[PDB]
DNA sequence: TGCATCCGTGAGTCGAGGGTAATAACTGCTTTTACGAGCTTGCGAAAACTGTAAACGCTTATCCACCCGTGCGAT
């Protein structure tokens, strides 16, 4: 089994799991490796970075829940690895270039 | 020294059903008291509006250290 067949199992891994608290120490748990060595692979396969691709699906889950849900800011932030929204709101003008407040009202 | 008038006594719980009636003047005249009518203050409400330290949600400016963007290495 290639390692092109082991990342291509992992981008089904997350896809329903990005709204429980998942992190590396998982992650490399339940694919049989070690907490570094995950990280070497990902590069050659798919040319992105992990531990901000989980975040980019994270953030790509807080636009589809406020687009859609009622949540507010400060504790779709608690799930998602943060304990407040002071840093949550502020990536979101690197991933989508907006405000976590401007995205509900532009329809 | 009787004799004659007089004041003061006379069980206790309950009970039922209730309260009265005879008879008595008219007039003109003058002073006091009440009843409704109509105001005057004033007092408790409704509906607006001008001063402050927090007043509901929410962005940044920072600092820093867990983690690890990757490379290269461990047997």
């Not at 400060?74 to 799930?79: E, L, S, V, Y």
Request: glycine share 2%; proline share 3%.
């Amino acid at each position: 089994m290639s390692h092109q067949k082991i990342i291509q199992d992992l981008i089904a891994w997350i896809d329903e799991h990005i709204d429980q608290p998942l992190n590396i120490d998982v992650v490399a748990k339940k694919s049989g490796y070690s907490k570094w060595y995950l990280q070497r692979m990902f590069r050659t396969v798919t040319h992105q970075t992990l531990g901000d691709y989980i975040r980019q699906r994270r953030l790509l889950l807080a636009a589809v829940e406020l687009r859609t849900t009622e949540r507010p800011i400060f504790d779709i932030a608690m799930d998602l690895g943060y304990v407040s929204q002071q840093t949550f709101s502020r990536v979101f003008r690197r991933q989508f270039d907006r405000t976590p407040s401007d995205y509900r009202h532009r329809l």
